[PDB]
Amino acid sequence: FDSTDETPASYNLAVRRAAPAVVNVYNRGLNHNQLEIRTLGSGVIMDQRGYIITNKHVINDADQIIVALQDGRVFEALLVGSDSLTDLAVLKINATGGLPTIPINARRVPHIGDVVLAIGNPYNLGQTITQGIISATGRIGLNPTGRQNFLQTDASINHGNSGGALVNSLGELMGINTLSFDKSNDGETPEGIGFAIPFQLATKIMDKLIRDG
Amino acid sequence: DSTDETPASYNLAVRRAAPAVVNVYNRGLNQLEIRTLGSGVIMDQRGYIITNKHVINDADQIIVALQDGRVFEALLVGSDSLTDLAVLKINATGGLPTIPINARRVPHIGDVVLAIGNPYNLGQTITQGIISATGRTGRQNFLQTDASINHGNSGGALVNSLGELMGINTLSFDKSNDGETPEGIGFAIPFQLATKIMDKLIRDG
Amino acid sequence: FDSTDETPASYNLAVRRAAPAVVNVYNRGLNTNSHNQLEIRTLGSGVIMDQRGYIITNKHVINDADQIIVALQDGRVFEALLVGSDSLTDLAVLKINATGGLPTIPINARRVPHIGDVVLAIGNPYNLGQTITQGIISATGRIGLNPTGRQNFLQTDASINHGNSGGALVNSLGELMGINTLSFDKSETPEGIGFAIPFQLATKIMDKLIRDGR
């Protein structure tokens, strides 16, 4: 066979569309005049004004919040506001050049079985893309998350992924990665159970935090 | 503008297969509480359900919960320790969703598969992997998969992108080497074998 | 008309093309406690690179071997000779002598691996037998300094376990992307973080070791 003309199966289109808007978020603290990285996570640039969604846990008790873009630009971020109920926080960067923004299709309904990519900075390795599916789109009854509206996914999520993007194969934002199941019942480590705040809610909470705080 | 583009998805398989995958509760006298939980697959309109033997062992009461909200008390038809399969029976009156079965489908290594079950009682969960290997003390024959399988997935379904049953999820490899956790190594009883075991158990033979 | 031809989504084509060329590699040492018998000390994977019987594996799989055994998926078993190893890249080259035709790994020298490409990892984790796992290319290298200490690793979330080392990472076409080498294993258990030597570097090192042995 000659595969030179065949095309490898790929979600690179989604990567090129979405990944430039996903940032590395650095929670710096003083411990001396010199600042040190205390926590790191990810964030998503939502619009051209410089508003960024991240996770509240990532940015709590920060003396300085740093945002690093995949294009090499580094900004100091301002905390616009945070919501403990949803674990979301909004940041603001002041930029000249123009900013990459996350694709959002407000009319897209996420479906269970949809291929998704998680985009973030696990263990400070640098931007990482992982692939899974939507395992669930919320819950009707009471469940161990205590919430009714999480997207669940088996796209590998690690420490440093929090605040980052979950996108479909088109690069459209599905959710903001927030949690990974860790409760081992009998020695066994949970595998491929992760949670994201649905994009519709993330949009709404951002808008309210921008205007109110 | 991706408005008319179509997201890559295995939702078709989900719609076809997931309604037939049930939550299995091993309940024990407390009053009455949940002891072990797993999953099960509704195999036919008669109300016969395949599950895992370790899920239902020593139960005072076996409860089966469907995704449509119906809850039934299940009766233990029989179990097979050699294959770790058990058959349950619920009230078939009122119509039941059943698992798609293609008896002529040959499972191939590299086939995309979805695992369907109730891990950690989170509610029905779909995970995606591929068939990693086939034909895997013990003389058992398994399909191996990297579709994430967790405590509570046992007795549940492994299906292909068409929603056709490939196997019954049974085991997750956890044998560490130099102090490390295995990732993406899971085992399912092939559907042909499971069907055979179910038939024998129903006959009581 | 009653039997239609719908087929499930599958990477079986890549499997059929690539998997025959991925071998199980056994590092065997003789012990002086049981009748000078050879026993397995380490196991990994390897990739048959050309018809002559040259095989890429990881250096750490074949370190201190009294005997290196190579097992093919068709059932053939060979004693391999160590051609050479490179500690800088953790690659080793083996040589087998076969009468029949050997299966070889598909290589497209003009293929550029892209982040998001579907990949399959092929190897022998925990001596279960050849195992195929599926992920994507998570990253194709790093510009900045990072915890791996290196700049050219392909990162992947295709599940990699003990025994996968020296084995193949291929795309959906069966074309070699890299040689699986490392897993991020200890700090929280990391999930879906694995590393492969890019096929271009693996090919350059192999040719060097075949020519010189160094």
Swiss-Prot record, chain A:
Primary localization class, coarse: membrane
Result when mutating residue 159 to P: Partially bypasses the requirement for peptide activation, acts synergistically with mutations that disrupt contacts between the protease and PDZ domains and with an rseB disruption
Entry keyword set: Cell inner membrane, Cell membrane, Hydrolase, Membrane, Protease, Serine protease, Transmembrane, Transmembrane helix
Effect of residue 139 to A: Causes substantial reduction of peptidase activity
Domain notes: The PDZ domain probably binds peptides ending with C-terminal Tyr-X-Phe sequences, which activates proteolysis. In the absence of OMP peptides the PDZ domain inhibits peptidase activity.
Organism: Escherichia coli (strain K12)
Family: Belongs to the peptidase S1C family.
Active site, per annotation: 57, 87, 162
Protein's recorded name: Serine endoprotease DegS
A single Gene Ontology CC term: plasma membrane
Compartments it resides in: Cell inner membrane
Catalysed reactions, semicolon-separated: Acts on substrates that are at least partially unfolded. The cleavage site P1 residue is normally between a pair of hydrophobic residues, such as Val-|-Val
Effect on the protein upon substituting residue 159 to A: Behaves like wild-type
Top-rank taxon, per record: Bacteria
GO biological process, one term: proteolysis
Residues of the full protein shown: 37 to 252 of 355
Assembly: Homotrimer.
Inactivation phenotype: Small, slowly growing colonies. 5-fold decrease in basal sigma-E (RpoE) activity, loss of regular growth regulation of sigma-E. No proteolysis of full-length RseA.
One GO molecular-function entry: identical protein binding
Keyword Cell membrane: yes
